[PDB]
Amino acid sequence: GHTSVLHSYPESVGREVANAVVRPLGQVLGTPSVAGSENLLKTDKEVKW
Amino acid sequence: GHTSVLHSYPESVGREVANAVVRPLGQVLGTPSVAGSENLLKTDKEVKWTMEVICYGLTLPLDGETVKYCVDVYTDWIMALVLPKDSIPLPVIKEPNQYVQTILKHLQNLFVPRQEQGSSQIRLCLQVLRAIQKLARESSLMARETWEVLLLFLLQINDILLAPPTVQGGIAENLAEKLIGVLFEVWLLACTRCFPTPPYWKTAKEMVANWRHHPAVVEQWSKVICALTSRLLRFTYGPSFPAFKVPDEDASLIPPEMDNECVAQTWFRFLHMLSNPVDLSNPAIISSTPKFQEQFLNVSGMPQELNQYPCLKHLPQIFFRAMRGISCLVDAFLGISRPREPRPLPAPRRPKVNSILNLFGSWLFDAAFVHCKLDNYEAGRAEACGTLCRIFCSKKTGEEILPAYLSRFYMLLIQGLQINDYVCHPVLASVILNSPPLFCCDLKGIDVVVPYFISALETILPDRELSKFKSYVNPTELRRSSINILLSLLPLPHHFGTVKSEVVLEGKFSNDDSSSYDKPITFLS
């Protein structure tokens, strides 16, 4: 179960995708604020992706 | 269902991840000279992830080759239905229907017009259109659900690219012909085998009524209905009946696999597919679509935008083209295959005049009278009784005609033949030219309109060169028709003499100024 979907693709584009997709999540999680943005994910497909 | 999962993320990061995914995958699958390479997709989760990430890429602007790779891999993937390819992943071949349905759902976002990349957008759109066209033309066996999805996708993209008002230099102007042609071709192919359900017919009829301001729509409809009616009359009567002429390409639009019984239903449904062509005469009705109403909210400039839109200047030509098409259809039904140049004699196997009136005359009568009440759409009005005027003269001898049709035709003839102030040269010339044997066909009560014809001829025969009519019809042919009409009325006085002729005084219709309107005029005068 530890296998990754992005493994088949080249490593450079894989790491580009990884950083580009995790940077906004890390920014949102850090520096908590009173305002509620309703997170970013809403449905099962989004959280699965 | 076409919304991409990646839309939640900000635009910049989404563009970056889409480009990063599409660069190697596109450069491998889309680019040629990649035979023998193992597929990068092996599992259903893999292919679903890839499909979603590629689907988000369409919304991105066409800058760079990312959109080119996306459309190329889409065209390669959709071609898997026609024939399997090495680059196609194995799970795609295993379950093709659902995957191609999802791809077609994703392709809807591509056709959305963009800001300034139309130079490449036109090429990409035509490539996708021809890819789908060849996909459906040589399609393998597939479930009717895929056909329904394809038809809905075509209707949706046509609605996206046609409903808004036409702006000069836009993509819609250059792509309307291709869109309508591919829509009609795919619809005919679907009716060949699937025969889509009545709800789809209703949806198409409702959607197509909003694209009547594009000149290509009426032309394509006319061509396809001419092909269908030629195919129908090819077997409705038999080889004895004259064959309707039709271009080879238009005859090739319909496939020969259709059985005789199925042709009638699709012919009727396509004949009524477009709304009443008389609607094109009214400019307010055309400029009342829901998109136009939404556009009317954005309308804040000239107050005459209800009748001065950029795309409302082509209405007279579109109406004339529709009237020409319906006139050609009526001529094919009647037996006058050639134009009007001599006109061949009507075939002995032609249907009764009342049936032709029931089938077509309602549209013809409405089109004639709507411009009778209205020099803007004169060509359509002239063609209207071109057709009508010609229909009645082809009646078989001793054939009964329903009196309502005769009354309507007589009213039309009275309205057309006016000289005082309500004179229109094209319709008058058409009425005179189209009906030489009008009086000779022993029409019941035709003698009532005799004084109007006498008054009309007094303003054409004494004229030397017919300057007013020389820009619409050939003066020599018009003179010949006038002579034929006059020569058929000379025996009437001496034959009748003192017999009174009824007068119909419903307003300022009579041309005489003798203050004897309430008096049946005898032929002696």
Numbering used by the authors:
A (entry chain C): 17 to 65
B (entry chain B): 17 to 356, 428 to 461, 507 to 657
From the study:
The two RalGAP complexes, RalGAP1 and RalGAP2, act as GAPs (GTPase activating proteins) that limit Ral-GTP levels by promoting hydrolytic activity. They comprise one of the catalytic α-subunits RalGAPα1 (RGα1) in the RalGAP1 complex or RalGAPα2 (RGα2) in the RalGAP2 complex, and a common regulatory β-subunit (RGβ)11–13. The GAP domain of RGβ lacks the catalytic asparagine residue and is thus not active, but RalGAP complexes require the conserved asparagine of the GAP domain of the RGα subunits for activity. The RalGAP (GTPase activating protein) complexes are negative regulators of the Ral GTPases and thus crucial components that counteract oncogenic Ras signaling.
Here, we present a cryo-EM structure of RalGAP that reveals an extended 58 nm tetrameric architecture comprising two heterodimers of the RalGAPα and RalGAPβ subunits. The resolution of the focused maps was 4.4 Å at the hinge region between the two “half-mustaches”, 3.8 Å for the central region of the RGα2/RGβ heterodimer, and 3.9 Å for the peripheral region at the tip of the complex. However, the reconstruction includes a portion of a second RGβ subunit of the adjacent “half-mustache”, which allowed us to unambiguously model the N-terminal portion of the second RGβ subunit and a small part of the second RGα2 subunit. The SD domains are the central organizing module of the RalGAP complex and mediate heterodimerization of RGα2 and RGβ in a tail-to-tail fashion, resulting in an overall arch-like shape of the RalGAP heterodimer. Interestingly, between β4 and αA of both RGα2 and RGβ SD domains, large loop regions with little secondary structure except for two helical segments are inserted. These loops reach over from RGα2 to RGβ and from RGβ to RGα2, respectively, thereby linking the subunits with each other and accounting for one-third of the heterodimer interface (buried surface RGα2-RGβ: 10,443 Å2, RGα2-RGβhug: 3923 Å2, RGα2hug-RGβ: 3574 Å2). However, the RGβ hug domain makes extensive contacts with RGα2, in particular the long hug helix that runs alongside the HEAT and GAP domains and holds them together. Unexpectedly, the structure reveals homodimerization of RGβ via its N-terminal region at the central interface between the two half-particles.
